[PDB]
Ligand binder design. Structure first.
Ligand SMILES: [Yb+3]
Ligand SMILES: [Yb+3]
Length: 129
Protein backbone atom coordinates (compact mmCIF):
# COMPACT_ATOMS: atom_id res chain seq x y z
CA UNK A 1 0.00 0.00 0.00
CA UNK A 2 1.20 3.50 -0.79
CA UNK A 3 -0.13 5.89 1.86
CA UNK A 4 -1.18 9.48 1.43
CA UNK A 5 0.53 11.92 3.80
CA UNK A 6 -2.53 12.65 5.96
CA UNK A 7 -3.72 9.02 5.86
CA UNK A 8 -0.39 7.87 7.24
CA UNK A 9 -0.27 10.60 9.89
CA UNK A 10 -3.69 9.50 11.14
CA UNK A 11 -2.69 5.85 11.22
CA UNK A 12 0.50 6.70 13.11
CA UNK A 13 -1.38 8.83 15.64
CA UNK A 14 -3.87 6.02 16.30
CA UNK A 15 -0.98 3.64 16.95
CA UNK A 16 0.50 6.01 19.55
CA UNK A 17 3.47 7.57 17.74
CA UNK A 18 2.63 11.23 18.33
CA UNK A 19 5.15 12.44 20.90
CA UNK A 20 6.42 8.90 21.51
CA UNK A 21 9.72 9.37 23.35
CA UNK A 22 9.40 13.08 22.68
CA UNK A 23 9.15 12.85 18.88
CA UNK A 24 6.18 14.78 17.45
CA UNK A 25 4.07 13.16 14.73
CA UNK A 26 5.69 15.18 11.94
CA UNK A 27 9.04 13.51 12.63
CA UNK A 28 7.58 10.07 11.94
CA UNK A 29 5.78 11.18 8.78
CA UNK A 30 8.94 12.91 7.49
CA UNK A 31 10.99 9.76 8.19
CA UNK A 32 8.51 7.56 6.33
CA UNK A 33 8.48 9.86 3.29
CA UNK A 34 12.25 9.77 2.84
CA UNK A 35 12.79 6.16 3.90
CA UNK A 36 10.12 4.53 1.74
CA UNK A 37 8.13 7.21 -0.13
CA UNK A 38 5.14 6.05 1.96
CA UNK A 39 5.26 2.56 0.40
CA UNK A 40 4.79 -0.36 2.79
CA UNK A 41 6.37 -2.77 0.30
CA UNK A 42 9.73 -0.96 -0.01
CA UNK A 43 12.85 -3.11 0.36
CA UNK A 44 16.51 -2.15 0.01
CA UNK A 45 19.60 -4.34 0.30
CA UNK A 46 22.69 -3.12 2.21
CA UNK A 47 26.35 -3.88 1.56
CA UNK A 48 26.70 -6.07 4.66
CA UNK A 49 23.98 -8.35 3.24
CA UNK A 50 21.20 -7.13 5.51
CA UNK A 51 17.98 -5.73 4.01
CA UNK A 52 15.72 -2.85 5.10
CA UNK A 53 11.95 -3.48 5.11
CA UNK A 54 8.76 -1.52 4.91
CA UNK A 55 7.52 1.97 5.53
CA UNK A 56 10.26 2.72 8.08
CA UNK A 57 13.00 0.59 6.47
CA UNK A 58 13.71 -1.55 9.49
CA UNK A 59 16.96 -3.51 9.22
CA UNK A 60 17.29 -7.31 9.30
CA UNK A 61 20.66 -7.29 11.08
CA UNK A 62 19.04 -6.47 14.42
CA UNK A 63 15.30 -6.24 14.24
CA UNK A 64 13.60 -8.93 12.19
CA UNK A 65 14.32 -12.32 10.67
CA UNK A 66 14.48 -12.77 6.90
CA UNK A 67 16.32 -16.09 6.87
CA UNK A 68 19.29 -14.70 4.98
CA UNK A 69 21.23 -12.39 7.31
CA UNK A 70 23.65 -14.76 9.08
CA UNK A 71 24.50 -13.76 12.66
CA UNK A 72 21.54 -11.41 13.06
CA UNK A 73 19.29 -10.94 16.12
CA UNK A 74 15.51 -10.50 15.49
CA UNK A 75 14.88 -8.15 18.44
CA UNK A 76 11.31 -7.38 17.33
CA UNK A 77 10.52 -11.10 17.18
CA UNK A 78 8.89 -11.01 13.74
CA UNK A 79 9.52 -12.16 10.19
CA UNK A 80 10.72 -9.18 8.13
CA UNK A 81 7.86 -9.90 5.73
CA UNK A 82 5.43 -8.74 8.43
CA UNK A 83 6.85 -5.24 7.97
CA UNK A 84 5.58 -5.10 4.41
CA UNK A 85 1.88 -5.37 5.30
CA UNK A 86 -0.73 -2.73 4.47
CA UNK A 87 -1.42 -2.79 8.23
CA UNK A 88 1.38 -0.74 9.77
CA UNK A 89 0.96 -2.22 13.27
CA UNK A 90 4.07 -4.45 13.12
CA UNK A 91 6.26 -1.63 11.79
CA UNK A 92 5.00 0.82 14.42
CA UNK A 93 5.55 -1.60 17.28
CA UNK A 94 9.06 -2.42 16.11
CA UNK A 95 9.87 1.28 15.58
CA UNK A 96 8.89 1.96 19.21
CA UNK A 97 11.50 -0.56 20.35
CA UNK A 98 14.16 0.95 18.10
CA UNK A 99 13.59 4.56 19.15
CA UNK A 100 13.77 3.55 22.80
CA UNK A 101 17.22 1.96 22.33
CA UNK A 102 19.48 4.93 23.13
CA UNK A 103 20.07 6.68 19.80
CA UNK A 104 16.50 7.91 19.31
CA UNK A 105 15.45 8.64 15.75
CA UNK A 106 19.09 8.97 14.67
CA UNK A 107 18.75 5.25 13.89
CA UNK A 108 17.04 6.36 10.67
CA UNK A 109 19.60 7.84 8.31
CA UNK A 110 17.00 9.70 6.26
CA UNK A 111 15.56 11.28 9.39
CA UNK A 112 18.97 12.50 10.55
CA UNK A 113 19.86 13.92 7.14
CA UNK A 114 16.56 15.26 5.87
CA UNK A 115 14.19 15.75 8.80
CA UNK A 116 16.24 16.57 11.88
CA UNK A 117 16.28 20.31 12.54
CA UNK A 118 13.69 21.14 9.89
CA UNK A 119 10.09 22.28 10.24
CA UNK A 120 8.66 18.78 10.65
CA UNK A 121 5.19 20.08 11.60
CA UNK A 122 4.76 21.00 7.94
CA UNK A 123 4.33 17.28 7.24
CA UNK A 124 1.05 17.07 9.14
CA UNK A 125 -0.23 20.52 8.16
CA UNK A 126 -3.73 20.54 6.71
CA UNK A 127 -4.46 17.05 8.05
CA UNK A 128 -7.66 16.34 9.94
CA UNK A 129 -6.18 14.86 13.11
YB1 LIG B 1 23.08 -2.11 20.82
YB1 LIG C 1 25.84 -0.14 26.11
Amino acid sequence: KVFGRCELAAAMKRHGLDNYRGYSLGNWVCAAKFESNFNTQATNRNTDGSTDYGILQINSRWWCNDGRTPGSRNLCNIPCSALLSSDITASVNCAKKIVSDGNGMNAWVAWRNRCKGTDVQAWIRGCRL
